Ligand binder design. Structure first.
Ligand code: HEC
Ligand code: HEC
Lengths: 157, 158
């Protein structure tokens, strides 16, 4: 079980998630979003190893699934490989945890967490309006935007 | 504990399970920003093997036996509920590089670079130094790897 939680079932700030299973990266640069992306700017997304094993067998997110979206800045727009976007420095993380026992009234049993900094002890749980509304509305599978996770789409049975 | 499988002629066999290796960073060179034909289209998701990641945490150096896989994917869209930008589509192919001072004593940095004809190919095709190493040698921040674009590596070294 890769998440740890407070008494009130708040996700403690994940550690070592960069050693979890990467499932996809997207980029919303500030310069293409009126100088402020909602989630600036590169997004590197990870699912915990245990939930990955379960996804390879079921194509479903189990209770205990932790997904971390790590934000990084655009570091440059041209390299020897051509023009585009290339990452810079880390900016922070978002996370979501699915758990029908801890979050029985949350849409999809998912809890969404923001993090004040990489130094924070624990996440801040989010109201449904702030995160779950957009994800339920538009994500291809169980409030996870799998249309942007080719690792997931190719790993499911 | 090495992650590269090789023929007897030291040819790297097509890496399997590298999507469970340690992701070190992602970039994108969209076709539309490169004359409709990027050199490596389009998203690049880069992995380093778990043993060499463990060694990199300790030393900030690539051990003998390092395998790095660059997985290419398409731009699947440019707009999503999160904003405008680039979002990946389907998998396009892989590039790889393997460090080995005994198998590859005459290659710059002892790196062998491999292209792969498709995801079905049994093995890679080792590349001449002109085709890959020359660019990597000449611009990569560290030991022919573009660590300026791998924040995972930079933050994970001592
Ligand atoms: C990516 C995200 C992830 C990664 C898993 C996933 O479902 O994709 C997490 C854990 C997370 N966000 Fe989310 N989000 C949105 C989109 C389109 C993507 C994938 C493409 C990309 O990386 O840009 C996400 C969309 C939205 C959004 C639409 C207006 C809302 C308001 C949010 N997301 C809000 C939140 C959170 C509230 C602070 C939060 C903790 C999220 N998302 C977590
Ligand atoms: C990315 C790459 C990687 C990942 C490791 C790394 O050093 O970044 C591999 C294994 C690989 N390529 Fe290379 N390449 C270049 C640049 C700037 C980046 C990182 C930024 C990005 O992802 O876009 C690379 C540069 C170049 C280049 C400059 C003109 C050439 C000709 C090549 N690369 C050629 C090759 C290969 C020849 C077929 C090959 C097997 C590569 N790269 C592997």
């Amino acid at each position: 079980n890769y998440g740890s939680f407070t008494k009130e079932h708040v996700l403690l700030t994940p550690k070592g998630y960069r050693e979890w299973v990467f499932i996809g990266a997207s980029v919303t640069p500030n310069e293409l979003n009126d100088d402020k992306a909602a989630f600036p700017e590169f997004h590197n997304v990870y699912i915990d190893p245990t939930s990955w094993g379960h996804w390879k067998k079921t194509g479903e997110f189990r209770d205990g699934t932790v997904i971390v979206k790590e934000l990084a800045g655009v570091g440059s727009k041209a390299s020897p490989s051509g023009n585009g976007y290339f990452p810079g420095e880390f900016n922070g993380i978002e996370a979501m945890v699915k758990d029908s026992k801890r979050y029985p009234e949350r849409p999809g049993n998912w809890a969404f967490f923001g993090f004040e900094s990489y130094e924070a002890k624990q996440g801040i749980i989010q109201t449904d309006e702030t995160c779950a509304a957009c994800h339920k509305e538009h994500a291809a599978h169980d409030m996870v935007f799998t249309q942007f996770y080719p690792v997931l789409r190719a790993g499911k049975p």
